[PDB]
Assembly symmetry: C4
Amino acid sequence: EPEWTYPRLSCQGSTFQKALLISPHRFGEIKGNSAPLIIREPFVACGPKECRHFALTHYAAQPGGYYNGTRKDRNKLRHLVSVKLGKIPTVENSIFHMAAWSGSACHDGREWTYIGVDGPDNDALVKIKYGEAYTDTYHSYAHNILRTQESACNCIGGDCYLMITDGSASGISKCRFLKIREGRIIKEILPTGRVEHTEECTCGFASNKTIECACRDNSYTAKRPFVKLNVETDTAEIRLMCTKTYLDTPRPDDGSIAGPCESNGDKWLGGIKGGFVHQRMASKIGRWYSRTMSKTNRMGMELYVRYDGDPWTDSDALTLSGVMVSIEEPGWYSFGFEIKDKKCDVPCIGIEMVHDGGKDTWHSAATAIYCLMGSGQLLWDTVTGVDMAL
Amino acid sequence: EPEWTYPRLSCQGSTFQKALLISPHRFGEIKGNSAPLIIREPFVACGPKECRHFALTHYAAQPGGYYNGTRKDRNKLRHLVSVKLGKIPTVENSIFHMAAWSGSACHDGREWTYIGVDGPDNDALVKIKYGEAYTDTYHSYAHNILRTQESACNCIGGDCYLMITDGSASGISKCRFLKIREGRIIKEILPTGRVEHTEECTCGFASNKTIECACRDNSYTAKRPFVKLNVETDTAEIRLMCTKTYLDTPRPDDGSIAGPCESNGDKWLGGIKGGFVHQRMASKIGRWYSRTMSKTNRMGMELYVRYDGDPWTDSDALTLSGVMVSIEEPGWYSFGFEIKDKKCDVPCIGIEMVHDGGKDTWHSAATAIYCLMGSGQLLWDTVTGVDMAL
Amino acid sequence: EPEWTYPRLSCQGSTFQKALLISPHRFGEIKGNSAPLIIREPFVACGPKECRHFALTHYAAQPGGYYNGTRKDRNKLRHLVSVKLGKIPTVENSIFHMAAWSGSACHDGREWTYIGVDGPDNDALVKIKYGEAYTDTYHSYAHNILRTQESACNCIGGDCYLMITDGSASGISKCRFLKIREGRIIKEILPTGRVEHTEECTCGFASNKTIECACRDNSYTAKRPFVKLNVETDTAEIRLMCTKTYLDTPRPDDGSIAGPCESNGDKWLGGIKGGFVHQRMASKIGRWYSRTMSKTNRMGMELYVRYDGDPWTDSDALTLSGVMVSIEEPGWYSFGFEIKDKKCDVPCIGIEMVHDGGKDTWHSAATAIYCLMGSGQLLWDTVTGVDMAL
Amino acid sequence: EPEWTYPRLSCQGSTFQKALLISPHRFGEIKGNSAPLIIREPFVACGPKECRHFALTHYAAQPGGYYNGTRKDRNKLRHLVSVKLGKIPTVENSIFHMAAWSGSACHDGREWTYIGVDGPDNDALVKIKYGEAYTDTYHSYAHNILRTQESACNCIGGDCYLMITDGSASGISKCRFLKIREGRIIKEILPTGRVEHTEECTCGFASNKTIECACRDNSYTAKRPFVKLNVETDTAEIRLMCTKTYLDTPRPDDGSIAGPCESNGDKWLGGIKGGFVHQRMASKIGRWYSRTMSKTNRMGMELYVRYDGDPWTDSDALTLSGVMVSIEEPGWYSFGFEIKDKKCDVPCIGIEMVHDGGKDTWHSAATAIYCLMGSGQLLWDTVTGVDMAL
Ligand SMILES: CCC(CC)C(=O)Nc1cc(C(=O)O)ccc1NC(C)=O
Ligand SMILES: CCC(CC)C(=O)Nc1cc(C(=O)O)ccc1NC(C)=O
Ligand SMILES: CCC(CC)C(=O)Nc1cc(C(=O)O)ccc1NC(C)=O
Ligand SMILES: CCC(CC)C(=O)Nc1cc(C(=O)O)ccc1NC(C)=O
Ligand SMILES: [Ca+2]
Ligand SMILES: [Ca+2]
Ligand SMILES: [Ca+2]
Ligand SMILES: [Ca+2]
Ligand SMILES: [Ca+2]
Ligand SMILES: [Ca+2]
Ligand SMILES: [Ca+2]
Ligand SMILES: [Ca+2]
C-alpha cells in the first residue's frame, strides 16, 4: 500500500547543468543495426523510484520505409510510447501504451496514469489509462482538435491535474483542467481570466496548494498565458506573463510590447511549448523558464530564472541563467519535471531537439536534460551529434 | 500465497474506443533492422497485474527466408509465443512457451496456464503447462485435428475452463470442455443440445456461475453456436444464436434465414473466430460481439451490442455499436479478454489484422485493441499502416 | 532465507512428448536482422522458479565473420552463456558467466553455481562460480584436457555433485566427483569399479540418497559406463550397463556383444553424451535413456524406458518409447534435467541438434525438449527447420 | 532499509585466473546485426548483489557512421553508460547515466552513486548522481581538465571516497579526495607529501580504516604515486612506490632508477591507469598490481603480487604472478574491484583491451577480467579475438 505523492522542497542548489542527452538517431545510420523510433513531443515524468521518457512515435523506425507523414502530428498510427530514462527508445526497448497523437503522464506515487488523445479532428477524445486498464475518457467540447499538455501532469494526494484544450489554432482555445484520481475524472475546472487561448501547458507545483503553468498562445501574443491552479478550492484563473523577457516564439525585441501587463501586443502568429519548473525553498520560490535563442526560429535554448514575485504583474526581465543549446542546434519543445531524491525534489528542464530535414525525409527528435545541481553557473551546452544524411 | 481470481463487475462505461494497435510489421522493412515474428491467431489474456499478447509464430521473422508455409496452420515448427501487452513481439522480445499450432492461455490469478496443441493430424494432443512445468495432456477423441479455443481460457477460484474440439472441418465437430486446476485436467464436460459443430470458441464469464461462448460452425450455418457453461453443476448445452445479425462469415443478408431460431439456413461453408465479451452490471448484462463488415470476405470489423435477453431465443438484431475497422483493411479473428483494474474488470475486444499477400510471400498479422471506456460512441477506426512491399 | 533443494517424486505421467524447440538459427539468415549466438554442448538446468538454457558459445554470431574454429571445442574465446528457457539465445539476450570450453550448472535451491573449464590442454582448470563471485577451482590431475559433465550438476541439501575427468580420449580417463557447497569444493570422491574411461556424465537423482549417471566411454566400449553415487557415504563405483540396447554411438547390432555384463566388446572408438533421467515413483523407478537412431552416425534420437532393475546387471533390452528425432535430422548430445512444479518434479530430456555443414561454415545447434506429460505414447518428432544456406 | 557496505576479509585463495572476457566488437562485423557501443575507460563496480560494467561511450556504435573523434577523449557527446556484468554493452542493452568524459561509480551498499565529468576544458565540473537524482557537483580548481579516477570509488558506512584532479598533463596536477554521502559532498581532503602529479587513481580498501591508491604520474616519473587515505582522520598523504618493479608505462629497465625511494628518475613523459587491488587476510595483506609487458608500449599485461610491507619504502621487486595478456594483444587501462560473495570479498583486476587501428577508423575496447580463485598459478591468458577489418 504505497503512499500518495506530494511536492516537496527542491534539493539544495543554485544553477542548472547539462545532465543527460538521449540522441536515439545517433544509431539510425543506414550502415547501423539499430531501430530507433521516429518520435516527437517527448517529455519526462518521474515516480518515486524511476523516471520515464515518453514520446509520440509515428510507429516507424530509422532506418525505415515510412518517413512520409512523420512531419504531420495527427494520424491513426501515432502512439504514446515510453522507456526508462537512460535507455535509447528503440522498437524493442519501448512500450506502447495507447494510440494517441497528443498526451501526458504522471505518477500519483502509487501507479502510472497515461493520457492519450486521438479520434477525428472535429471530435477527438481524451483517454485515461491507470496502469494496464483503460479507465475513462473526456470528449471534445469546442470540437476543434482536442489536445493536451504534451508534458507530465501533476498529482498530489492521489489527485492528478491535467490541462486539455479544444479550439482553433488561429482563434479561441479556452482550456480546461481535469481532476483525475485512480484514472477517473472526478471534476473539471473551468479557468477564468484571460482565456481566449491557452494550450500545451507546462504545469508544475509551486506549492502543496498551488500549481502554476507556463502555457502557449498561438494566435494573440508572444507573451505566455500563465495559469495559477488552486488545488485547494479547485479553481483556476489565467493572466499573461508581464515580463519583458517574452518566452514564446516568435516574439519581438524583449520589452518591445508597450502598454500594461495584459497587453497582447502584435499577434505574432504561432507559439511553442516552453519549459518551466519550480524550485521551492523554505521561504523563497524560484521559477525557471526556457525559450529559444532565435526569436523567430526554433533554434537554441537559453535558461532564465526569477525568484519570487508575481509573474502576472512583474514587468522585470528574467535573469539569463545560461545557454542550454546554441542557435546552431535545433531547440523545440521544452518541458519541466522533477526527479524525486531521498527527501527533496530535483527540478529539471528537458529540451526536444527535433532533427528536421524537410518533409521528404524522416522527422525525429533527441532529448536534452538539464537539472539543478550545485552552485556556480551553467557550464556546457548540448548538441545532438546527429547527421541526417546517414 | 496470492488469491484465486474471479470475474467481477465491469468498470463504468457505455461505449468502446480504439485503445491500442500492435503492428509488428511496421518495422520489418528490408531496409529496417528489426526482427518481428511472423504469427497468426493472436489473442490477449490478462492476469491481476499484467496483460500478455499471445500468438502462434511460424518460427520465422520478417525480413526472413522462411516465408514458405507461413500461410499453413499446422506444422512441426509452430510455437505459442507471448510478450507483455504493449511490446512489439520480436525474436528477442518474445518468449516461446511450447511447440503448438493451436492454443490458449489464462491466469488463475496465481499462475499462468498455457495450452498448446500439436502432434499428427489424426492424433493431435493438448498440452497443459502450468508456469514452467509441463503438467498434463488430452488426446484426440474424434481423431480429426484436435484444436482449441484460439483465445484466452477462463479461470474462477482456481478452476480454468477450456473448449477443445475434434472433428471434420466440413462435418461433425462436437466440442468438449476441460476443467483444469494447477495444470491438471480434473474433469471433462460433454456439452448437450446442438453439438454437430462448435469450435474456436470465444468464452467469457457472464457471471460467477455462468460462462458463455460465441463459437464457430464451419459447415452448417452462418449462425454462431452459443455455449452456456454452468460452472456450478459443470454442465454445458449449445444452441444457435437467434439474432438476425448473423456474426459468422460468410453469411447471407441479415435476417434472411427464415424459420425458427434453431434454423441452420444454408450451409455457407466456412466461418471465423468471432470476438465476444461480457459487460456485467449490478442488474444488467451487456454482450459485445464483433463481425466483419463484408459478409463474404474477412475485411473490416464492426461492433455490436445487446443488453440482457437470451441469445438462444432473441430474434432481435444486435445494436450496431460502431466500426472498429473499415472494409479497406483486413479483419480476421476477433477475441475477447478483460483487463483487471483496481476493483472492476475492463471488457475488451481485440482484432487480428492479417497481412495476407498471397502464398508466395510472408503471412503475418497486427493486433488491434478496443476497450470499454467512458460514454459516447466509438470515435475512430484502426488501420495496420503496413505496406507488404517493403 | 530460501530452503535447500531436494529431489522429489516425479509428476504423474507415463510418456514423453515434444514440448519445446529452440532453433536460434531460424533467424540468422543473411537477410535477417538477428544475432543468434554460435554455440554447442547446450543443456538445461532448473531452479525452484526458473529454468535456464546454458551453452558454450564460440563468442560469435550468425550472420557473422568468425565461423572459423567454431567446429573446434577448445579455445581462449569460448564462454558459458545462458538465457531463461524459452528465449532465443542472442548476443543481447544471453549473459556470459565465464570463459570456458567445458561446463555445467546447477541450483542448490538458493543460488546458481556455475562450473567452467579452460586453461592449457595439459593443465586445464575447473572454476566454480557461486552467483556473481568466483569461489573456487580444481586442477587437472591426469594432465589431459580436464573436462566436465556438459550438463546440469545435482544439488541436495546444499550439496552439489559434479563429475569431472582428466585423461586421454583414446585411453584412460578415470573420472572424479566434486562435492560442492556455496561454491567451494568440500570433498572429492574417487570412484571404484570399472573406471578406465568415464566422461560427459549425465547424472540425476534416483533417490534422496542415490545419484546415477549414464556416462560416456570413448575408447573401450559402445556400452555406457554407469555410475551410482551414494550421497550418504559419499562414495561411487562404476560398472557397465548390461542391456543389449547399447546407448553409445557408434555401436554394433543390439545384443551383439557376447560375454557377460562387464564385457567391453569391440572398442568402437568414440562415443557421445547421452540423455538419461529418472522418474521416481512411490515404489517404482523409471529410467529414461536417449540414443541416436543411426548406430554409426549422430542422426535421429529415440527414447527408451526401463522401470526398476539394476542397469549394472540387467541384460534385458530397453523398452523403445518413441522417436524424438528422425534419421534425417541431426541428433547429437542428449541431456537430462527436471523442471520443478508445485509439489513434484517433471523429468525431461533435451537433445542438441547440431547444424553441421562442414568446417568451412558456421557450426551451431538447436535444442529440442521432450518431457514427461500424461499417458499415451510419444506422438510427434522434432525438426530444426534450419537451412544452412541462408 | 539495507545496510551500509564495509570492506571485509577477501575470500580464501592464492592466485588469479582468467574469469571473463567481454569483447563487444566480436559482434560488430559489417555482415553482423549487432550494435555494440564504441567505448573506452571501462571499469567494474560491484554492489551487494550485482556487478556492473561501466564505460565511456562516444555515443556511437559499430558498425556505425561516427567513427571520427572516437579516439579523442573529451567532447559534448560522451556518456557514462553501464550494463550488468556479463551482458554485451549494446545500444539497447546499456543505460546512459549522464553526459561525461571522465567518471567513476560505487555502491554504498544501499544505492548507486555515479560521478561524471564534463564541461569546458578550463572549467570542467564533477557531477554526482545518487540513483536517479542529480545530487551535487564540484568545480575545477586548477582550471585544467578536471578529471576523475576512471574506476570504482570506495564506500564505507555510507561514506564514499573519490579522487579527482585538476592540472596540466605535462606539469602539476595536485589531486583531491571528495567524501561523499547520499550523493552530496560532505568534505574535501587535500593530500600532503609528494603531490606534484597524481591522477587516474586506482583506489581500494586495505582495511576498514585505510584506503590505498596506486595512481598515475604523467610527467615526472615512471614510478607510481601511492596514496594512503585514512578514513578515520580523513587525511591523505602521497609518496612514490619504492619498488624496482616500476608499474607505469613507459618505464626504464626495472631497478634502473638510482637514488632513494623518493627519486623520480627520468621524466619518461606519459603514464597509464594501473590495476591494483587488496587481498585482506586476518594477519596478512596482499597487494596485487598490473602493468603492461612492453615497457614502452601498451601491449600485454602481467600480474604482480607483494604481501605486507610498505609500498612507500620497500625497494624489493614485486613477485611476478603471471601473464594476463601477451605482448601481441593490447593492454591498456587496468583497474581493480571486489565482487561481494556470501561472507567474503573477491578481489579482481580488469584490463581494458583497446582495439586501436588508427584515427581513421573506430576506436573501442574489450574488457578482460581476472579474479582470485583457489591456489596454483595463473594458467591462461586473454585475447580479444577481434579483427578490426570486419
Ligand atoms: C499546428 C497544429 C495546432 C493544433 C490546433 C497546434 O498548435 N498544435 C500542435 C503544434 C505543434 C508544433 O507547432 O510544432 C506540434 C503538435 C501540436 N499538437 C497537435 C495535436 O497537433
Ligand atoms: C481450415 C482448417 C480447419 C481445421 C479443421 C479450421 O477450421 N481451423 C482453422 C481455421 C483457420 C482459418 O479459417 O483461418 C485458421 C486456423 C485453424 N486452426 C487449425 C488448427 O488449423
Ligand atoms: C574429441 C575431444 C575429446 C576430449 C579429450 C572428447 O571426447 N571431448 C569432447 C567431444 C566432443 C564431441 O565428440 O563432439 C565435444 C566436446 C568435447 N569436449 C572437449 C572438452 O573437447
Ligand atoms: C592526454 C590527456 C590527459 C588529460 C590532462 C590525460 O592524461 N588524461 C587521459 C589520458 C588517457 C590516455 O593516456 O589514454 C585517456 C583519458 C584521459 N582522460 C581525459 C579526461 O582526457
Ligand atoms: Ca532488440
Ligand atoms: Ca504565441
Ligand atoms: Ca534485440
Ligand atoms: Ca459458418
Ligand atoms: Ca537486441
Ligand atoms: Ca564408446
Ligand atoms: Ca535490441
Ligand atoms: Ca609516468
